[PDB]
Design a binder for this molecule. Structure first.
Ligand SMILES: [Cl-]
Ligand SMILES: [Cl-]
Ligand SMILES: [Zn+2]
Ligand SMILES: [Zn+2]
Lengths: 372, 372
């Protein structure tokens, strides 16, 4: 039919649910994102040790671009002059960018947080963060906020949450005031409040009044331990709008992801598969292994016995053990490809199990084997 | 026809000639090698920063496996137990292995050369070198010799050449005494004699009396300068059997290769494209460039304007400049793939021009542009 014969800026659809868990899609102009989603991290315009085509071969639909490094070198204006981050690095699908503020605090010197933003050895305000993300050509822009250390007293957590909510409104208005950005990208707000239910509620209410395309749970990748993280998620995720994506920033280990999905999270990112891969840790369905251990020196099996990735089709543990011990670049490449593929296969199993109404059983089976 | 409906152990055929230059093929059980050939170097069971499929995509028909690192770690017996070097690293085509002796002298400590071979901090005799190369599963085995430093006095050059010829006979007999090796691999002898015509002649005569599948010109990648290298090649290559391959070990820069082919060399290896690629040097038809230079920070052109490699199809100088300056693994990967592809495209242009009787013109055109 003629009538049957482009993607929207942003459309999140939920296809299936089981308990608090959801599966569906985010459609954007640069592609579809299957949820729950894992985003590999690109630290300085590269997912370390992988060509973009290899990232895509693992199943990733979207990557996270750290802003902090790029705003320093090559610089946001320079990247824009060169055609934007997508062209520059050769990834044509969606990119979510962080605001830059957290890595300023973790990596910079002589930092000072204030109502104007953060200065460091350079000023990064909410408005400038949104502009930088625009210049990079981000598809999902994160509101600029003020981080809360862990542990935090109730007073400190309230102060940084309140400032973050003022910054969320400033971020909203800056994004909306740039027509090309408002029409082509999406903006996510970040819930704060440390581990305190009342502050988490105040933050969710403030963000919902402003209105965002998605809602992150901030402040939980900070050393609190899984029991506490899950306790906070238990009350925090229900506070967010149900019909928008829920993004748990900086999480995490495979079992963290499974439990967070059980609590209503749709999106994840962390450096664990890439960074710990380069350090010799490989993820397997039977738990992580450190490939440098002497027990692998003559092990002809692949990293994981079921994994479908190209690394596991072609190379042995023994070979990868040799490469990592020798400091060879190919060792980093192979470990990273496998680990990112493992994470994507985890997400696929999560999505399929929710779609089939058997996610609770999947989670129990996953844990029993992973922690055996 | 029924009558028309495996490859030999070794068959070198010359399809075309121009002056002293030749083009043709070496057929072996694991594949065909197009000559003149460039062999990427695999230092520790990896061509640094490349999967084998990427090495093959550049056009390489054969790689060089350094023996020295592998005989120490993982060890030759261990590699054999794991199925041999080809299986271990995932390269199923021919591998030429060096003897290990030169890298003992260049990288080891407390070395001592004698009529038994070389001891170091471990003994490596001619017989043990051949055995190690067997355990790795080498397709082209290099005779074990004794290197000559540059400069060398006539007396020293004669002594090491004479010992090398005694070691060449020992290598021949060791190779022949191992039936599986003799039937499936090839053995090359190495001409020595430093820069001295009379010693080069004595060495060629000794090697021809023993008999080898191919003949290397040893001792010329040692700092002597191109004029002197070419002068020695002028008289040395004609001394070798015409109907066998001529291998110039450790050479070299693009213009070294062109001039060596003009003097009758069929095979080459060096670390320049890989090692200097990781250091930021990219080869182009207009000469080498250092991609770290600030002049490339906003240059959207590919590394080379004509190169057919995947790197030049997909990424800019500006991006690769950023990666190398940032110390990113992907920078090493992309520089290395391009440089090895450039070397293979050089070899292809050499082969085609000899096949078409226009190699002299190619060499003159190549130099005029490369040194402009
Ligand atoms: Cl990383
Ligand atoms: Cl190298
Ligand atoms: Zn795998
Ligand atoms: Zn290229």
């Amino acid at each position: 039919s003629m009538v049957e014969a482009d993607r929207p800026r942003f459309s999140f659809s939920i296809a299936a649910r089981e308990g608090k868990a959801r599966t569906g899609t985010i459609e954007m102009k640069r592609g579809v994102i299957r949820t729950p989603a894992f985003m590999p991290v690109g630290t300085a315009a590269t997912v370390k040790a992988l060509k973009p085509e290899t990232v895509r071969a693992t199943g990733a639909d979207i990557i996270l671009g750290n802003t902090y490094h790029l705003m320093l070198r090559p610089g946001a204006e320079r990247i824009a002059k060169l055609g934007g981050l997508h062209s520059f690095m050769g990834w044509d699908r969606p990119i979510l960018t962080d605001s830059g503020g957290y890595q300023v605090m973790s990596l910079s010197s002589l930092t000072k947080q204030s109502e104007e933003g953060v200065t460091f050895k350079h000023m990064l305000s909410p408005e400038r963060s949104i502009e930088i993300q625009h210049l990079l050509g981000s598809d999902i822009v994160m509101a600029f906020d003020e981080c809360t250390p862990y542990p935090a007293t109730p007073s400190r957590a309230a102060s940084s949450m309140e400032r973050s909510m003022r910054f969320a409104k400033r971020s909203r208005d800056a994004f909306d005031s740039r027509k090309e950005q408002a029409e082509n990208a999406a903006l996510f707000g970040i819930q704060q409040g440390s581990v305190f239910e009342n502050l988490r509620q105040q933050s969710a209410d403030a963000l919902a009044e402003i209105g965002f395309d998605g809602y992150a749970v901030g402040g939980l990748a900070v050393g609190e331990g899984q029991d506490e993280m899950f306790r906070v998620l238990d009350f925090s995720v229900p506070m967010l709008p149900d019909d928008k994506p829920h993004y748990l920033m900086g999480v995490g280990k495979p079992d963290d992801i499974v439990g967070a999905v059980e609590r209503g999270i749709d999106m994840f990112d962390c450096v664990l598969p890439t960074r710990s891969g380069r350090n010799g840790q490989a993820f397997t369905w039977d738990g992580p292994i450190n490939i440098r251990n002497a027990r692998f020196s003559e092990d002809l099996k692949p990293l994981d016995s079921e994994c479908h990735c190209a690394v596991c089709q072609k190379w042995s543990r023994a070979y990868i053990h040799h490469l990592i011990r020798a400091g060879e670049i190919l060792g980093a490449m192979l470990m990273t490809e496998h680990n990112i593929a493992f994470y994507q296969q985890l997400m696929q199993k999560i999505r399929d199990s929710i779609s089939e109404g058997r996610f609770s059983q999947f989670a129990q089976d996953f844990r029993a084997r992973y922690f055996a």
